[model samples]
Target: GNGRFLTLKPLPDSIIQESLEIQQGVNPFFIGRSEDCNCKIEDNRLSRVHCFIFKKRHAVGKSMYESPAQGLDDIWYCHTGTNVSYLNNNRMIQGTKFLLQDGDEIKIIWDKNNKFVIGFKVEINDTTGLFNEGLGMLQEQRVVLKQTAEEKDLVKKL
Candidate 1:
């Protein structure tokens, strides 16, 4: 066992999407300006359906942390409207997918003064055998750390 069996890290609700597990089937995390959006931020530059961050299986059926193959991106693009989203202080290009890591910071800007930071933590503790050196394979457990001091630090850093 590497660490955790399974931990789900739910992002903060936007405005209306109270539940983290939405009806997106596999992808259940979202952030936008719509009433039904998850992790909805209050910004004039955001569109109704801004963006979504979710866990998706790779084309060859593999997770992001998987060795062989993995999903191209974990963050999906949305309308965005006039959003200026950044990854590690770098501007993100649209028309594709966005991916971040455990200790990465995403800066979101809309108007001049309306802006916020998004901290992405892929998995806090993953006990899945894919990355485990002892168990080797056959383990089916992926955990996202629920709470940590890094959460606050991620925001403060941005």
Candidate 2:
């Protein structure tokens, strides 16, 4: 039997808000975007979705009790750009949210199980500014494992 997979677009803010209200703090965490994004699956293999992550730097108030903290932690949203998809059948359906400042790099890798591994790197350049004032960038790098003919050739050689 052939399997059927369906991809759904993220709910609108109003629906999300209502869901949040209904679920209270139990609402699933997810990245937000201002527009619709595209998603596609080909040859039963997932495609790569790339984006940038951002983080802002903040100064701590001077106090005798403690040294200035590295930076303030703020919630950042993910804007779905080109080559983005909604992951289904994730084990952690609750979803996870990450903070992105101005030039953060985000890489999303989809696995065979229909789940994805998400990673992000943040870069700050003084030439820009400070905190969220600086520029932020992000990219998604995907890795796929496949069998190569070279391996078979080596075995035959042996």
Candidate 3:
């Protein structure tokens, strides 16, 4: 039952921007002015249900820049509305989508002057059962190793 957040960073140009954290793992999250969208962004250029981001898996991912978007684990796809939109400043094709990174940036513009920008990030809870299972198994193995060392006086051999 562990959950994660789809953190939305405020627009960089704003004097004050509030990041929105939407709980994930339910149905795919929709973003737009549409009443149907799970998350609504106030943008004049955006069509209702213009774009949405979804998590690929609950496993560890995009730890560093080596691969912020290791693959399709976390992805964001934007549709062309009144104007062009982009992921990381690259034009986003209507039928194209891109993997979203911990700090990937998105830009939507109504014209050359009007724009909407948002940043993406992820935060996971350590409450998953897999973690506990892995931790316990490692602990048991360490205990076995400790017993082995005790039997052979191996502490000094290192």
Candidate 4:
């Protein structure tokens, strides 16, 4: 019966663009979500329904990226890079800022039955060409690292 809360108001595109410039390499820029939205975390699981702004790149067939998670909703408006028609439901969105409406429902069901943890995030960078083949400055390697407890501790030691 406990919850987390956050709030943001929709900003004009110009303002958003300005803000992006201000915080270029910091944490991912947060847009606005439905007001009074409630997020839940229970039994080591977390879930929330929120709207996010994603930047639309000039590159064709590139929209978003997703991670391996079972029983998750496919992201809207993004296309799958590999199979063409097979849209990549994994990535939420990237690049732009938008607002999510209230009453939007997002659920996160932790698969305790599975042996691995799952997660996802988005990236935005400049690209060029019809296929984004050769572009100027692109974000590279959104990665997932599978590590043991010893390996995790070793990173901390470093």
Candidate 5:
């Protein structure tokens, strides 16, 4: 499971501005106004059974523990809701699988002036940097590459 998780945070302007952490193995996360939903929205316009977020699964030939290995494809997908849902500002087409990327934003309702009423920012966990995860600004100081002082000066000229 590589410690992959999601951080769902409501937009600053949203009335219910709170953050939710979704851990792995919580497959088929339901997001809506219903109390049963993992990420419940306080907005009345939202459907009870809004969009669904789940990891795609694939069937492999054989497994040591089982006859057929039901393995996770390691891809996260989203199913659109009854109300119009936008992922990263693009209108989601009904009955289609949309791949979600890190830092994608979801808007449930749009305003009259072409803005969102309720929305959330989706943050994907960087599994490779488990050590640096949730370390705040200190994580930014962790440099991935080291360069000579002279090399850094040369790049600035171009």
Candidate 6:
């Protein structure tokens, strides 16, 4: 019930058309020029497997405090090639995993002439709805409790 979805929107300068909507299906979402890649870029400079984005699951029993739910502490992260990927203008190290946040800018190959970028958007459910409902119920219960206390006082005085 509590899961974050990914909607990869293409930047204005990006060469791809249509956004990549990643649901919770496959494990790792591949990106590159490889035939098995989910988001394939038609560029010669792109490696066979340029990068990959995947949801990292916390270790079992260790995530009890972090997330009491079945699948808790699920975070989206990406691993890119040494000199090809950049996250929000900062170059990423090769074989290193970088955690992605909402509204983050991803550049596959950052250069002056050729630019390949995409906007990362994380879709999460509204977290305040349940809290608001419980708060309202508590307020109503308080009023009823007060009225019952007054009735008990009246009965005792009779």
Best-fitting candidate, measured by TM-score? 5
Lowest lDDT 10-residue stretch of candidate 6:
138-147
- Regions more than 4 Å wrong, model 2: 1-66, 70-95, 100-105, 112-121, 127-158
Q: How many clashes (backbone N, Cα, C below 3 Å) per candidate?
A: 4, 14, 1, 11, 0, 0
Would you give me the overall lDDT of model 1? 0.37
Q: Put down candidate 4 lDDT per residue, 1-158, tens digits, no spaces.
A: 02212122212321111112211222122222222221111212221122222222222233447522212111111111111111122233221122122222221121446421221222223211112211111232222112234322322321
lDDT by residue for model 5 (1-158), tens: 44546677776676447787667424556666765666666666666545555544433455667532334343233434456666664565433344455565666665655443777766756433222232222213322222234323322222
Instruction: List, residue by residue over 1-158, the lDDT tens digit for candidate 2.
Output: 02211112222221222111101111112232221112221212222222211222444455566543435433232222233422222111111223434333343333546444333332222222222332322232122112235322322221
lDDT of 6 by residue, 45-128 (tens): 665455566544433444555533333333333445444556664555444445454555566655556554433343333222
For candidate 4, the 10 contiguous residues with the lowest summed lDDT are 78-87
- Give the number of the best model, judged by lDDT: 5
Per-residue lDDT of candidate 1, residues 63-95 (tens digit): 557464332323222223346455544454331
Off by over 4 Å in 4: 1-40, 45-90, 93-98, 110-158
Report the candidate with higher lDDT, 3 versus 4. 3
lDDT of 3 by residue, 19-133 (tens): 5555543324556555456555666656655555443342454558563222323333434344455654456543334444445555544443544454333333332222221
TM values, all candidates: 0.45, 0.24, 0.51, 0.17, 0.58, 0.57
Off by over 4 Å in 5: 1-4, 58-80, 113-116, 126-158
Misplaced by over 4 Å in model 1 are 1-28, 59-79, 93-95, 110-158
Candidates ranked, most accurate by lDDT first = 5, 6, 3, 1, 2, 4
Candidate 6 TM-score over all chains jointly:
0.57
Off by over 4 Å in 3: 12-18, 24-27, 57-73, 78-82, 115-158
Ranking by TM-score: 5, 6, 3, 1, 2, 4
lDDT of each: 0.37, 0.27, 0.42, 0.21, 0.51, 0.45
